Design a protein around this ligand. Structure first.
Ligand SMILES: CC(=O)N[C@H]1CN2CC[C@H](O)[C@@H]2[C@@H](O)[C@@H]1O
Length: 323
């Protein structure tokens, strides 16, 4: 049984609760299993947070209200869709770090790396971990879904982490600590594949499942981890192929571009075709593949209305879910 899900970047682009419910409708209609809500990145923290100071119970341009988010989750569960929170750590963190800076600059200075305003200090910093863990505790409560008790998952990020290749055991220790936190709330942790190396794999909590979007290349020029490697160290993977299964909605696209994307998906997508350095659509014959996801990243969607976002995304959701 291979799962299929839709990942939605609501940090780079604003989505109303109605847009999101319409998208979930389409996921359910075509038998999709989950929706991954990527709500925390550099540009914005796009859900309500008592901890971070986003508490308005009024609809606004910056974050889903708590009531809106809970409504969305309940609507999803009623249609047998699991909602997977995605909070990106320790990089891709500028949006919530900027909120901490507002709340408490002393704390900000105690937890941000000295070189990157986008990156939480994962290099063995207890106050940084404690702060993260408080945020995670709020997120794990917010996304509680009793219908899926024992099956909940949370994406914890781990993509494009500066310093992670050199300082790999610190990165892995950090990821293991936040995995511990989510596992205490009976969530399965997940992370992207790209910043884990040969050096870290043996120390990484194999409770993690891996969102495998693009095989990395090490500073040596050597290939980084592939799906067989993950299998060999006890990790399950999901196919998030960066070419076949990424789409960036844009105001410059026409209907013809969406049709082309579907014709491209016809040949480029398969459940087990992963993005490897040698082959962008590499078929893997391992036993550790659990599913796939189409992801809508938000950074090109600047001038799109909500109606136009639906116009581009609905057909792509349907086409992917029926392939
Ligand atoms: C896991 C991942 O894809 N990470 C980044 C890189 N990808 C590549 C395609 C997008 O730019 C997207 C970007 O929005 C994401 O933040």
């Amino acid at each position: 049984d291979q799962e299929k899900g839709i990942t939605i970047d609501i940090s780079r682009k604003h989505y109303t609760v109605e847009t999101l419910k319409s998208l979930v409708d389409e996921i359910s209609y075509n038998g999709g299993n989950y929706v991954q809500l990527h709500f925390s990145d550099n540009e914005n923290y796009a859900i309500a947070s008592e901890y971070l100071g986003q508490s308005s119970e009024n609809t606004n341009n910056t974050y889903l209200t708590k009531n809106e988010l809970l409504s969305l989750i309940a609507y999803s569960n009623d249609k047998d869709i699991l909602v997977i929170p995605d909070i990106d750590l320790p990089a891709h963190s500028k949006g919530w770090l900027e909120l901490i800076k507002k709340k408490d600059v002393k704390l900000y200075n105690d937890i941000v790396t000295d070189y990157s305003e986008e990156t939480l200090d994962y290099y063995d910093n207890r106050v940084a971990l404690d702060t993260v863990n408080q945020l995670l505790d709020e997120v794990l409560d917010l996304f509680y879904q009793p219908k899926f008790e024992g099956k909940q998952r949370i994406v914890l990020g781990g993509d494009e982490v500066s310093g992670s290749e050199v300082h790999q055991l610190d990165f892995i220790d950090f990821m293991n600590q936040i995995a511990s936190t989510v596992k205490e709330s009976k969530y399965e942790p997940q992370m992207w594949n790209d910043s884990i190396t040969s050096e870290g794999i043996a120390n990484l909590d194999d409770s993690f499942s891996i969102l495998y979007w693009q095989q990395s290349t090490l500073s040596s020029g050597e290939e980084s981890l592939n799906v067989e490697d993950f299998e060999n160290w006890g990790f399950s993977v999901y196919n998030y192929n960066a070419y076949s299964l990424y789409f960036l909605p844009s105001n410059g696209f026409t209907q013809e571009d969406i049709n082309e994307q579907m014709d491209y998906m016809n040949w480029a997508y398969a459940h087990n075709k992963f993005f490897y350095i040698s082959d962008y659509y590499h078929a893997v014959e391992t036993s550790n593949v659990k599913g796939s996801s189409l992801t809508f990243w938000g950074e090109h969607a600047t001038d799109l209305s909500q109606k136009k976002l639906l116009k581009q995304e609905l057909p792509l959701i349907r086409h992917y879910l029926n392939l």
